Amino acid sequence: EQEDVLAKELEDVNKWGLHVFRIAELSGNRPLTVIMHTIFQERDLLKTFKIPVDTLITYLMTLEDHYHADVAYHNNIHAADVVQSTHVLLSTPALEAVFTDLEILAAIFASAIHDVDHPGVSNQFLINTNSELALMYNDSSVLENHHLAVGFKLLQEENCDIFQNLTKKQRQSLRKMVIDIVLATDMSKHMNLLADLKTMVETKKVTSSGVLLLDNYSDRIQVLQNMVHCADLSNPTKPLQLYRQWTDRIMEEFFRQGDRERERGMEISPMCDKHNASVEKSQVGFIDYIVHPLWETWADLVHPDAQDILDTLEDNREWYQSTIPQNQVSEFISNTFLD
Ligand SMILES: CCc1nc(Nc2ccc(CCO)cc2)nc(-c2cccc(Cl)c2)n1
Ligand SMILES: [Mg+2]
Numbered sequence: 533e534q535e536d537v538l539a540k541e542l543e544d545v546n547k548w549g550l551h552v553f554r555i556a557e558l559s560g561n562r563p564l565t566v567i568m569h570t571i572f573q574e575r576d577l578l579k580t581f582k583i584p585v586d587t588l589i590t591y592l593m594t595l596e597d598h599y600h601a602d603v604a605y606h607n608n609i610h611a612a613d614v615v616q617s618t619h620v621l622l623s624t625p626a627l628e629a630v631f632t633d634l635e636i637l638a639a640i641f642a643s644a645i646h647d648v649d650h651p652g653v654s655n656q657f658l659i660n661t662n663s664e665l666a667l668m669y670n671d672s673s674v675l676e677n678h679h680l681a682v683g684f685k686l687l688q689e690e691n692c693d694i695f696q697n698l699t700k701k702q703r704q705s706l707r708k709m710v711i712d713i714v715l716a717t718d719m720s721k722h723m724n725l726l727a728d729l730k731t732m733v734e735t736k737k738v739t740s741s742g743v744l745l746l747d748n749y750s751d752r753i754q755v756l757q758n759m760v761h762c763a764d765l766s767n768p769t770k771p772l773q774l775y776r777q778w779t780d781r782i783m784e785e786f787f788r789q790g791d792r793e794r795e796r797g798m799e800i801s802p803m804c805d806k807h808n809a810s811v812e813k814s815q816v817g818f819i820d821y822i823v824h825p826l827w828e829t830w831a832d833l834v835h836p837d838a839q840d841i842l843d844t845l846e847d848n849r850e851w852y853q854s855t856i857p858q859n860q861v862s863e864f865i866s867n868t869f870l871d
């Protein structure tokens with residue numbers, strides 16, 4: 533019954549707008565595991581890299597287990613979303629056959645793990661509260677280093693090493709790439725990642741069919757980084773009914789952080805006070821200063837494969853703008869997305 537219903541939903545796996553919460557419900561809360569399984573099958577990754585399927589599922593389950601259920605936004609469902617969004621972006625026509633199987637695997641694996649073991653509070657909070665994680669990582673890309681460490685550490689569990697049949701050289705190459713990718717999801721790197729991307733765009737060379745030419749490692753990894761960062765910041769480009777659910781979830785996570793700051797007598801971080809909240813104005817700010825600039829630039833790079841994403845983005849802005857009842861934003865943007 534429910535498995536017949538789940539398999540129909542998964543037929544939308546190559547579509548922006550997949551009903552990822554439905555899949556979350558239908559899979560017994562195993563969206564990351566079911567979506568990754570599907571994507572590996574779709575892209576023949578098991579055959580290519582000789583990944584026993586039992587080993588895959590075992591790895592996925594443990595990975596998914598290490599996302600925290602009680603965290604409202606940074607959980608397995610968000611990870612599942614990002615995996616799938618990256619999977620779609622990898623098939624964009626301007627990228628047809630640009631990437632090797634290994635590079636593709638790296639991007640999908642990076643996406644699956646990029647937020648694993650997230651505690652639901654920001655780097656800054658971890659630094660300001662003197663947490664063990666901030667002490668371990670010397671205040672630099674604290675969460676993102678930890679995600680990486682956890683994601684690779686889990687490969688060592690019984691029957692979890694999905695990479696056992698890669699060569700030593702494929703393993704090293706893949707590990708560099710994943711690290712470069714997940715470190716680029718540290719939000720404080722955003723302005724620089726975008727600036728560099730704009731620059732690359734200016735000197736970009738395509739084929740007759742509009743397909744991108746990427747000579748070196750440096751250009752390829754940069755594209756993979758921006759790709760996964762776009763997927764990470766893809767919520768406002770989705771159908772509004774999904775976008776709104778995510779908005780409610782992210783704000784619930786922030787407020788919970790704010791509640792922890794309050795209880796402890798700390799200044800309440802921007803965006804994190806439920807009592808001085810402005811949810812709608814904030815999303816508009818978020819689109820104008822971060823998301824739209826980012827997607828506009830990605831839209832140039834793959835022109836014109838993403839026109840529609842921009843269209844949806846613009847509609848979605850209108851919606852939020854229309855529901856604003858008739859410094860925080862700015863301070864949040866200064867603190868989160870700059871170095
Ligand atoms: C609903 C989709 C959504 N995603 C995001 N991602 C996102 C942003 C920052 C962090 C770092 C702290 O952990 C993590 C995830 N950020 C917003 C947001 C909300 C209010 C104001 C602003 Cl400028 C943005 N909205
Ligand atoms: Mg993250």
Ligand SMILES: [Zn+2]
Nearest residue numbers: 614646647764
């Ligand atoms: Zn994320």
